[PDB]
Design a protein around this ligand. Structure first.
Ligand SMILES: Nc1ncnc2c1ncn2[C@@H]1O[C@H](COP(=O)(O)OP(=O)(O)OP(O)(O)=S)[C@@H](O)[C@H]1O
Ligand SMILES: Nc1ncnc2c1ncn2[C@@H]1O[C@H](COP(=O)(O)OP(=O)(O)OP(O)(O)=S)[C@@H](O)[C@H]1O
Ligand SMILES: Nc1ncnc2c1ncn2[C@@H]1O[C@H](COP(=O)(O)OP(=O)(O)OP(O)(O)=S)[C@@H](O)[C@H]1O
Ligand SMILES: Nc1ncnc2c1ncn2[C@@H]1O[C@H](COP(=O)(O)OP(=O)(O)OP(O)(O)=S)[C@@H](O)[C@H]1O
Lengths: 686, 258, 160, 67
């Protein structure tokens, strides 16, 4: 006991531990395990962070407070580790005799002292089971499920001496009370305020968006992180002081470099920069002056906070000794007087200046969790309003036509930023049923290039690969008994990388209806469980389907066949598999339409922009006759095909004599090329 | 052991979640499993675990794991057309006797745990055959796909075969005013309130209805009709918090007004 | 420390280390996670092409240049060798006899060091969990993506 | 073991009445402390409720002792 153990009760006696609120039936349950005749030793099972070690802690706190039931009053709790154990036993019999010696140390401890084991699934086996049988080994363990089972579930005393107690992830409100317990502890370490919408929004959004770590733990390190952020901000200077300090240090290192001169006053023709340099000195004294003012304010605030807690630990040690009149004149007396005038003074300090930031606040929490996912609230103060309010203009840079479609998509993303969508659904559930040659993939690339500013994050998946049973085994993963079980799937791993992004599907109809049903999982609800064995949240990505159910009837429907009927044999495979919650609870069947003249001329222009971009990389510039654009616009159109073979007319009419002459060396860089229809076709000229 | 058949329109797993929030006070504990994952041969190696010596053995299948953790729960089964007949017969060891072994080497109790199967064999044909199909005849063409694998051991050893039915329009009014409430929670998130006329709510009633499609154009008819201009006026900075919105109808498209 | 580990800050002071350009939000993010009171243990994830141990050594460059915010300027950084610890694994029992004494030395510098760990999926382990639990051991890890996937993602203390 | 706990623990009339008397002792500790004795020492109702709950608490206390 000299070497191997740590008294928890004494570290409680220094108040080093932190209080734990609740779980009362768990505590009575465990004490019921403790003062039994046999099976004296309980098991705590759950997830990590749920508070198993902290349940042991607050138990020991209740013991040193004397609030324990009788018999246990005075009985001590010590935690035994490994690591002091596993010292230099290179030869046989050493470690065994250590453990035997501390078992006899327990024997002369006469049943008084409760032992604790953390990480029961570490640990012998022979040496404990009779002492376990007698009840002499009076211990407590803690682990998770799989560590328990795969440790072993099935050793005779190692199940027989022990009893399982489920902790579980508690409610929102319980964790709220926990944060109400620990908020003062973290104002001690973290020197700032605590706002109530910060903690209730922290519990709510941590419950919504983090899908791996549990309450309370995710709210806890939300608080620890954000308070760390505010100390990080206040510890440094504000960025106006920093960049304005950069021009201050820039100019004083400019003349500081320029003091070493032949005749310094002669080459000081820059006398106004000497004067304005003294202005940087004075202005710097202003910024540092307000800076030390704010440091005096919040520094004094941190002192009276910590000294206030010294009054509180003082009054609790006074609760241990019980001198009621002194306690009543202190906590009913001198301390809350200085508290309320102290808060009037510190709110006067909070309103006396502006660069001070003392609250937590909930918006900071929204920025942190927003940084883990990608959905902020803080763009509202930012210049989101421009690019959001020209979202139709932004997409109508690189997609002409179909205003209905871009308005539909745009309104969906706008109400996603509003927060109006069902949290228990995916955001976007889209179906584009239009003709060919219309720029579906243009729209998808436009949107990925809108948010994530590339066409990387757009997760393209062909569905024409898929006909058979094995298709879902492709995208989802393999069952166990196969190497692909160790591997996993495309999709599950893919959104498990980055949560909230774009998922793209192409010619969706050809697959099996099994595909469509697991779509109906992730579109009715937005969850899917992999073959590996874990649920995957989809509920804040956007899925997009452009396809060809309707297309072989879309090419004959326009105009004259009704959108109900191509909605119907489009709805052939659909109502074959999908139900009213799908079609009524997807976003839209989006219809497209063919193009006219200025469509084709416009996409000729923005098509040419990339050509000017690449030749602009190569040092060439091109001027084009309007008539050449007229002939190309004459060439590109065909009704059955739409916008596509315009590109063919571009490359074969333009690019081939251009390629011949550009490798001919006739064309010299720096001299801007001109394009003339000095033919029946387009010719090139310098 | 209940099977849920007929048309849909109705929120079958919504009723399941009503039980999950009923007795377990949340929809978390209600373990849900798709059958349309499970059409393969290899599906059993997903749900029950692996045979010895191979990849995935010492980890087990999460069904027996979840039941063996907390014994007496509610197990959700879904869209049962798409499964495999062995899973039907492993399931026949479920409904008979309430016990089931794994690949790992032991059995798991079921005998105080409810299994619920939402399925579509009705709504695969009943919303098509809306004239003349009775509960017995729906059991017959149910027993087209059903009768081969599912036998009177299966079909007798399920408890009750609950058929459903389409929706009254006042029901749809009830669902709509249900769906308003969480939107009012979104308003109390931001400090707002919607008033509505009776008549604009009547517009949502006359728009949301579809006989074949049940009530289910309701919510997307709602937020598609009203939340898009709402999101415009909010994201504009136009709409001030601390105020009341009324759903007026400047004309037959519903408009939100401060 | 002295027995096994290597001072990176000393190498930056001797100019042996390479500068980096940009990424101020990420190194600020790391500082932000280092100002935790507990679990104060950030992990870098990416390919080896993304150069993250260059990021931590350029962080050490910022520390020596004092452009780190305050409080950390008293601290110094060392990186851990696995091999000189683990190479004496002849019998069953000897490695932890080294490792616990190492942990006591970390308890002897008393929070004035900031530990770096590389190849976190290689990193024993049960003894690490309490010191990382309390936030006593103030360490920094960095590793690869599917190394973290075959680490185990649902491994109990280690996610936490 | 559990019924032995419920015996050895303090009973529910004893502990509920203990909470009510201890709230009445802390409220009494704030009420005997006067800012205006002629105003704050109007407290007669709190002190007769004090003696009342000392009667009830003391009697159930004594019955608990005898059992
Ligand atoms: N109810 C609670 N009240 C206060 N703090 C809590 C509570 N639950 C969890 N915590 C915190 O969560 C931390 C981790 O939980 P533990 O007590 O270690 O139990 P755990 O679930 O075994 O986690 P481990 O030790 O990683 S397996 C504790 O140290 C507390 O700081
Ligand atoms: N409105 C448009 N704006 C710009 N380019 C367009 C437009 N319509 C078609 N295109 C061009 O046509 C090409 C093919 O269109 P896509 O973007 O692939 O969509 P699509 O017409 O439906 O054909 P898919 O993708 O095979 S279904 C694009 O790469 C563009 O070069
Ligand atoms: N009659 C109804 N009453 C209440 N909610 C309903 C009703 N009909 C549909 N819903 C809603 O519809 C959504 C999904 O209902 P579900 O429970 O999935 O119906 P379902 O029959 O289970 O469909 P599946 O899962 O494709 S078999 C939820 O938001 C329900 O609240
Ligand atoms: N922004 C950068 N600045 C400087 N060097 C960089 C940068 N990005 C990558 N590198 C270099 O990338 C190389 C490999 O990456 P490392 O920094 O060693 O860490 P890494 O990502 O783990 O790759 P490893 O070490 O091979 S596993 C190093 O030589 C770095 O110097």
């Amino acid at each position: 006991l000299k070497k191997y153990t740590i008294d928890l009760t004494e570290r409680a006696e220094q108040g080093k531990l932190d209080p734990v609120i609740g779980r009362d039936e768990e505590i009575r349950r465990t004490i019921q395990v403790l003062q039994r005749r046999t099976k004296n030793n309980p098991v705590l099972i759950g997830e990590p962070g749920v508070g198993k070690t902290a349940i042991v802690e607050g138990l020991a706190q209740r013991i040193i407070n004397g609030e324990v039931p009788e018999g246990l009053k005075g009985r001590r709790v010590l935690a035994l580790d490994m690591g002091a154990l596993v010292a230099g036993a290179k030869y046989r019999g050493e470690f065994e005799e250590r453990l035997k010696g501390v078992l006899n140390d327990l024997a002369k401890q006469e049943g008084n002292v409760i032992l604790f084991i953390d990480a029961l699934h570490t640990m012998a086996g022979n040496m404990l089971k009779p002492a376990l049988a007698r009840g002499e080994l009076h211990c407590v363990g803690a682990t998770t499920l799989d560590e328990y089972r795969q440790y072993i579930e099935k050793d005779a005393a190692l199940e027989r001496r022990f009893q399982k107690v489920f902790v579980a992830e508690p409610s929102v409100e319980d964790t709220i009370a926990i944060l109400r317990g620990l908020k003062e502890r973290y104002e001690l370490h973290h020197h700032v305020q605590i706002t109530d919408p910060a903690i209730v929004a922290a519990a709510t959004l941590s419950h919504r968006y983090i899908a791996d770590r549990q309450l309370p733990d995710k709210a806890i390190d939300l608080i620890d992180e954000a308070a760390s952020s505010i100390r990080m901000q206040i510890d440094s200077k504000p960025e106006e002081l920093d960049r304005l300090d950069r021009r201050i240090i820039q100019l004083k290192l400019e003349q500081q470099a320029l003091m070493k001169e032949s005749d310094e006053a002669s080459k000081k023709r820059l006398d106004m920069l000497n004067e304005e340099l003294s202005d940087k000195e004075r202005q710097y004294s202003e910024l540092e002056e307000e800076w030390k003012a704010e440091k005096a304010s919040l520094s004094g605030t941190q002192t009276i906070k910590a000294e206030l807690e010294q009054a509180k630990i003082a009054i609790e040690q006074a609760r241990r000794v019980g001198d009621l009149a002194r306690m009543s004149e202190l906590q009913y007396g001198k301390i809350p007087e200085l508290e309320k005038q102290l808060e009037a003074a510190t709110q006067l300090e909070g309103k006396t200046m502006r660069l001070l930031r003392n609250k937590v606040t909930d918006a900071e929490i929204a920025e942190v969790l927003a940084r883990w996912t990608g959905i902020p609230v803080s763009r509202m103060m930012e210049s989101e309003r421009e690019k959001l309010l020209r979202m139709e203009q932004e997409l109508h840079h690189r997609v002409i036509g179909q205003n209905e479609a871009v308005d539909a998509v745009s309104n969906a993303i706008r109400r996603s930023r509003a927060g109006l969508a069902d949290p228990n659904r995916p955001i976007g559930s889209f179906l584009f049923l239009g003709p060919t040659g219309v720029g579906k993939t243009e729209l998808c690339k436009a949107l990925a290039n809108f948010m994530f500013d590339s066409d990387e994050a757009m997760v393209r998946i062909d569905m024409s690969e898929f006909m058979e049973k094995h298709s879902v085994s492709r995208l989802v993963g393999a069952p166990p008994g196969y190497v692909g079980y160790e591997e996993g799937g495309y999709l599950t791993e893919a959104v498990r990388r980055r949560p909230y992004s774009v998922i793209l599907l192409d010619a969706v109809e050809k697959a099996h209806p099994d595909v469509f049903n697991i779509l109906l999982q992730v579109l009715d609800d937005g969850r899917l469980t992999d073959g590996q064995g874990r649920t995957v949240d989809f509920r804040n990505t956007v899925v997009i389907m452009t396809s060809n159910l309707g297309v072989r009837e879309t090419e004959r429907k326009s105009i004259g066949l009704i959108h109900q009927d191509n909605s119907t044999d489009a709805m052939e495979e659909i109502k074959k598999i999908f139900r009213p919650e799908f079609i009524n609870r997807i976003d839209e069947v989006v219809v497209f339409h063919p193009l006219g003249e200025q469509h084709i001329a416009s996409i000729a222009q923005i098509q040419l922009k990339r050509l000017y971009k690449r030749l602009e990389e190569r040092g060439y510039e091109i001027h084009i006759s309007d008539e050449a654009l007229k002939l190309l616009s004459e060439n590109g159109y065909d009704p059955v095909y739409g916008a596509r073979p315009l590109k063919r007319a571009i490359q074969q009419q333009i690019e081939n004599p251009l390629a011949q002459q550009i490798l001919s060396g006739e064309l010299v860089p720096g001299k801007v090329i001109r394009l003339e229809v000095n033919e029946d076709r387009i010719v090139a000229v310098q």
